[PDB]
Amino acid sequence: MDVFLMIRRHKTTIFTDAKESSTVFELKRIVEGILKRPPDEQRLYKDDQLLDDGKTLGECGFTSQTARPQAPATVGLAFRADDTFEALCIEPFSSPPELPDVM
Amino acid sequence: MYVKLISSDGHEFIVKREHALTSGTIKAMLSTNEVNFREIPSHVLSKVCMYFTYKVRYTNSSTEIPEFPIAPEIALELLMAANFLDC
Amino acid sequence: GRPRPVLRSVNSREPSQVIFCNRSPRVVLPVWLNFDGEPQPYPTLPPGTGRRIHSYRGHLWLFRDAGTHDGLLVNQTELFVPSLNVDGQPIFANITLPVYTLKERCLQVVRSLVKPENYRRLDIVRSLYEDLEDHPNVQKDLERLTQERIAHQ
Amino acid sequence: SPNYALKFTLAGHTKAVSSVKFSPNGEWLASSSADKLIKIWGAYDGKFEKTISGHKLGISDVAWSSDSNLLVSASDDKTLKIWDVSSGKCLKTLKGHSNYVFCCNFNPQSNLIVSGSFDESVRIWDVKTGKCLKTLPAHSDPVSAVHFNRDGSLIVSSSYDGLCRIWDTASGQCLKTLNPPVSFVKFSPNGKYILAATLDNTLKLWDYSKGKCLKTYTGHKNEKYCIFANFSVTGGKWIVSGSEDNLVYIWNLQTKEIVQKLQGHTDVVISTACHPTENIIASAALENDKTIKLWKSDC
């Protein structure tokens, strides 16, 4: 069961996939390859909830039904360097304009 | 290989190179592994990246394919993006 | 004497039992090409339903959205041709959405929201007006498939 | 060659005319129509005689009893009706088919009626009681024509299944079969042959006892409608049929040569009939025409 994700930090969004059976730790290894920060310098979140490295993505509620190619689920990302922890902060995307009269 | 696609308002989208190459326009712009769009905003470009994931996953797949959803409020700018991107 | 359309059913009179299986979210219109190549509409299939139907070997079928005539796929391709049943087993015609281009999907959505009279009230380039006005049509696919079949000759 | 010429046009129906039949005594012409009416005409002068009504949908076919006193009709309303010609009274409604009834005939004794239906059956009815006596189900597509032979011991039927079946009246069992849809069949007036039409612009004469095709008639257009053909034997010996090019074709029965084409109708000529004692042909045409024509010849 593939799961499709947006990993978001500040004004950065990574599109990637994993399995429901993938661990949170294994997702950090995916992020490491892209962003070059090791798993122990990463914190991953689902909404406000800090995710436990050992738990599977499925156990955290990312399923093939909630994390779809055309509507991926969001994972928050924050970094740590030594004793300094960054807080989770995700900049929202822009907003569409008013719906035109003839729609 | 990942590429970085940057929206008009500065949001960075990191996507598989194979996925971004769905668009011949992006392929040309890549010829850095980053592409700056001058008029595609983040809410549209994020929807375009979902399309790429959908297209690559469901192409050649010989399974039941779900609809690609588009909300009314985004449809007209997404159309313009799709036309520009030829995807 | 005259050419006949290459896309037309063969009058085999050899029965073939088929399951039309609508694996799309659309209401599906089955279209049968008759022996002269004219498209004939058959009863529609709601989403998530399937029906066992009687057709014939060498008959030609296509499948469209019943309301918009968007093109659909059948066993991952445009045309479905029944063959002989083997071992008492019906033949499945698995109808699904194609992977539309993002542009075509956007055109489908905008068409569903704007009356054709009002397309040119939208604030986009003229070529997108013409794109919106170019509605789906089984004849397009018949033309396109015929040209492709000629290019493999 | 005969010299048929147009004598009268009868313009009483308001939709396609499906069938014309001369009464065995020569006096009358019955017509049936998509307009749900039967009309009776003088056979010699085309004079309107009466309208006969009661069917709820269009009528495909009509046929006379041997004594010219009864008519049976076959309708889209799934029934047949037996009528008293003198009064116009519906004596019986024959209920049993489960879809349109296209064709009907009395046997020579006229104690039985045979019918053929879109429901792919041939049914045999008792005239006196109106009960269905037998249902003969072997055709696998609409039945286009049914006809008794000269002593009524055999029925011939034709069907879109491509087959002509000869049935034993008494038992109901099929005795013989004679590939495009067969649109018309009837026994010859002498009894030896069967005339069959198929939707490939072809009529064929069959020696059914021998199972052999003796003649083929072509030149006309018949690919869509079930067009009734006939034997003309009062003068010379001709085959007569309508056509989809709006003409009546007449062939020499032995040479298979076209000897006349009768011009005048403005739609498919679906029905032709030949008068039992004089050299008179009646023809009937579909929705762009809606008329009956009467034609007369010296031979």
CB contact under 8 Å between C121 and A101, yes or no, is: yes
Contact A7, A39 (CB under 8 A): no
Q: Nearest-CA neighbor of B87 among B68, B60, B65, B64?
A: B68
Residue C75 to chain B, least CA–CA distance (Å)? 7
Residues in contact with C88: Cβ distance below 8 Å, sequence separation at least 6, in sequence order: none
- Per the listing, tokens 């067969």 go with D182
Query: Reduced to 3 states, what is the DSSP secondary structure of residue B74?
Result: helix
Chain-chain contact of C103 with B54 (C-beta, under 8 angstroms):
no
Contacts of A4 in chain B (CB under 8 A): 53, 57
CA distance D256 to D22: 25
Contact D115, D74 (CB under 8 A): yes
Q: Enumerate the residues of chain B whose CB falls inside 8 A of the CB of residue A15.
A: 13-16, 19, 49-50, 52-53
Q: Which residue has the tokens 């985004």?
A: B74
Q: Are C91 and C16 a contacting pair, CB within 8 Å? A: yes
For chain A, the DSSP string reads -EEEEEEEEBTEEEEEEEETT-BHHHHHHHHHHHH---GGGEEEEETTEEPPTTSBTTTTT--TTTSBTTBPEEEEEEEEETTEEPPP-BPPPP---PPPTT-
Name which of A9, A26, A12 is nearest A80 in CA terms: A9
**CB nearest to C106's CB, from B62, B67, B79:** B79
Q: Which residue of C has its CA nearest to A100?
A: C122
Task: For residue B60, give its domain range.
Answer: 1-87
Q: How many structural domains are present in chain D?
A: 1
CA contacts within 13 A on the Cβ side of D212: 4
Question: Which helix (H) or strand (E) covers residue B44, if one does?
Answer: helix B42-58
How many angstroms separate the CA of residue C47 from the nearest CA in chain B? 12
b/e map C66-93, b = 16+ CB within 10 Å: beeebbbbbbeebbbbbeeeeeeeebeb
- On whether the A2-85 domain is CATH 3.10.20.90, my answer is yes
User: Is C54 in CB contact (< 8 Å) with chain A?
Assistant: no
User: What is the rounded CA–CA span in Å between residue B21 and residue D296?
Assistant: 82
| B76 Cβ under 8 Å from any chain C Cβ | yes
Q: Domain range holding D173?
A: 1-299
Phi, psi torsion values for D116, nearest 5 degrees: -135, 145
Q: Inform me whether the C-beta atom of residue A63 falls under 8 Å from chain B C-beta atoms.
A: no
Q: How many domains does chain B have?
A: 1
- Chain A, residues 5-44, CB within 8 A of chain B, namely 6, 11-17, 34
The nearest CA of chain C is from the CA of B79 a distance in Å of 5
Interface chains of chain C (3 or more CB pairs under 8 Å): A, B
Helices C126-133, B72-85: crossing angle, 10 deg rounding? 110
Q: Kindly report the length of chain A.
A: 103
Domains of chain C, start order? 15-96 (2.60.40.780), 102-146 (1.10.750.10)
**Chain B, nearest residue to C125 by Cα:** B80
Residue B12: count of CB within 10 angstroms of its CB = 18
Q: Do the Cβ atoms of B12 and A12 come within 8 Å?
A: yes
- Kindly report the number of other CB atoms within 10 A of residue D221's CB atom: 17
The crossing angle, in degrees rounded to 10, of helices B42-58 and B72-85 is 70
CB atoms within 10 A of CB D223: 12
Q: Which of A10, A17, A35, A93 has the most B C-beta neighbours within 10 Å, making it the best mutation to test the interface with B?
A: A93
Chains that touch A (3 or more CB pairs under 8 A): B, C
Look at strands B12-16 and A12-19 and give their pairing.
Answer: parallel
Asked if the C-beta of A55 comes within 8 angstroms of chain B's C-beta atoms, the answer is: no
